[PDB]
Structure formats: C-alpha cells, structure tokens
C-alpha cells in the first residue's frame, strides 16, 4: 500500500503531533487542495467545520482498495502517512465536489 494509517478512527484536533502537516477543511473546502510532501510524511487532515467531512481515495490509488477515511466530526483529525512518490487524488465521500490532491516527491 502507498500509505500507513496510524490511527483508524479520528482523534482530537488538540492531540496532533508537532511536526505536523496540517491541512485544514472549512467552509465545504478542503483549505490546501494541492499539497506536496515528500516521502514518509505524515499528512493531518483537520475538520474546522461543524459539517462532517473526510478524505476518500478511490480503490487502485493508494492501495488496492478504496481508502474510505472515516468521518471528521468538528475539531477532529486524521492522518496518513505516505510512503511511495506520486499524486493521489482524493474526494470528501458525502461531498464529492470537494476535491484536493497530495503530490508526494
Ligand atoms: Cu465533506
């Protein structure tokens, strides 16, 4: 797989490790749709909003599966670590128009 989950369910947007790649989501938007990281960087997603978000990798890129994360609640988290360079594109599951893309060199 491309990427490694360290924690499968959401957790506090207060419990984010410090060096952390934060890309916030507010006002039906994901804040930084094109984000470049480099190779096992841990990218957090944070849910600013009270509206439920999450990020959503259809199945072939970042594993054989689709990456369905879990729904964001407000001031929750999620992280992924990616461990291959490439683009991955990704998609809100509820809100398919909210659209971002990570570029891992
Ligand atoms: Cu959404």
Redesign the pocket.
């Known amino acids: 797989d491309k990427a490694t989950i360290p924690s499968e369910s959401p957790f506090a947007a207060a419990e984010v490790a410090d060096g952390a790649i934060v890309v916030d989501?507010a006002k039906?938007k994901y804040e930084t749709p094109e984000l470049h990281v480099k190779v096992g960087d841990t990218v957090t997603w944070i849910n600013r909003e009270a509206?439920?978000?999450?990020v959503h990798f259809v199945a072939g890129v970042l594993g054989e599966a689709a990456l369905k994360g879990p729904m964001m609640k407000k001031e929750q988290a999620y992280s992924l670590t990616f461990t291959e360079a490439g683009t991955y594109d990704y998609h809100?599951?509820?809100?398919p128009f909210?659209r971002g893309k990570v570029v891992v060199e």
């Open positions: 989501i039906m509206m439920p978000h999450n809100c599951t509820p809100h909210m």
